[PDB]
């Protein structure tokens, strides 16, 4: 699990620079001669060292050489292509241009070997479901003032009071937060039954159903705090 992020190529590409610098750096400061032999002959050793240090297999992937082929094919291609151009390049600056050419070719490889994942909207959890359940404490309490102050109704407006405090009390205390019965899903649908039930129901528990189901439903949701039954 996330054992390693970088790879031998990506990781090594930073080390080969030192080998190359030893050769490229040695190119200048020396006599007009011997500057050519080292640039071509020292590169052989420098590239061999990285390759000799990039020894990897990774049987997990089907690729065995293709992964390293990209590094060497492009690396040698630019090197040989960059040098080859020097032969045709204008003697006005064929050597400086030649050396500069690799650096760019060599630098871009670091940009082409980048994972390049970029996955907008990877689907992340905005909020933990375990929380926001505690607020049920107030909901259960605030429910009382809805039950009594409603009961005082003369058999009229009784619901209105609930719809008043239920929608208000929840929002009024927390106006700037969860403005609407959403803090805990299921209510939006489950509540809807209330109007589907308190219309055609036996004439005896018409209110009791409303009192019992709401309290009962909210209680079940109470057990959620104990355990959210996580995978």
Curated annotation (Swiss-Prot):
Transmembrane segments: none annotated. It comes from the Eukaryota. Keywords: Allergen, Secreted, Signal. The keyword Secreted applies. GO terms for cellular component: extracellular region. The keyword Acetylation does not apply. It is found in: Secreted. Belongs to the Poa p IX/Phl p VI allergen family. This is Pollen allergen Phl p 5.0101. The chain holds residues 55 to 285 of 312 of the full protein.
């Amino acid at each position: 699990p996330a054992g390693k992020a970088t790879t031998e190529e990506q990781k090594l590409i930073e080390k080969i620079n030192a080998g190359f610098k030893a050769a490229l750096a040695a190119a200048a400061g020396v006599q007009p001669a011997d500057k050519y032999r080292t640039f071509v002959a020292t590169f052989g050793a420098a590239s061999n060292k990285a390759f000799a240090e990039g020894l990897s297999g990774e049987p997990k992937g089907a690729a065995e050489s293709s992964s390293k082929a990209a590094l060497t094919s492009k690396l040698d291609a630019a090197y040989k292509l960059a040098y080859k151009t020097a032969e045709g390049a204008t003697p006005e600056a064929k050597y400086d241009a030649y050396v500069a050419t690799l650096s760019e070719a060599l630098r871009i490889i670091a940009g082409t070997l980048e994972v390049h994942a970029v996955k907008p909207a990877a689907e992340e959890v905005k909020v933990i479901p375990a929380g926001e359940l505690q607020v049920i404490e107030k909901v259960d309490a605030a429910f009382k003032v809805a039950a009594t102050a409603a009961n005082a109704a003369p058999a009229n407006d009784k619901f209105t009071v609930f719809e008043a405090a239920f929608n208000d009390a929840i929002k009024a205390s927390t106006g700037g937060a969860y403005e609407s019965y959403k803090f805990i899903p299921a209510l939006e649908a489950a509540v809807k039954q209330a109007y589907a039930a308190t219309v055609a129901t036996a004439p005896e528990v018409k209110y009791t159903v409303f009192e019992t189901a709401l309290k009962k439903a909210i209680t079940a949701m109470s057990e959620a705090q104990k355990a959210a039954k996580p995978a």
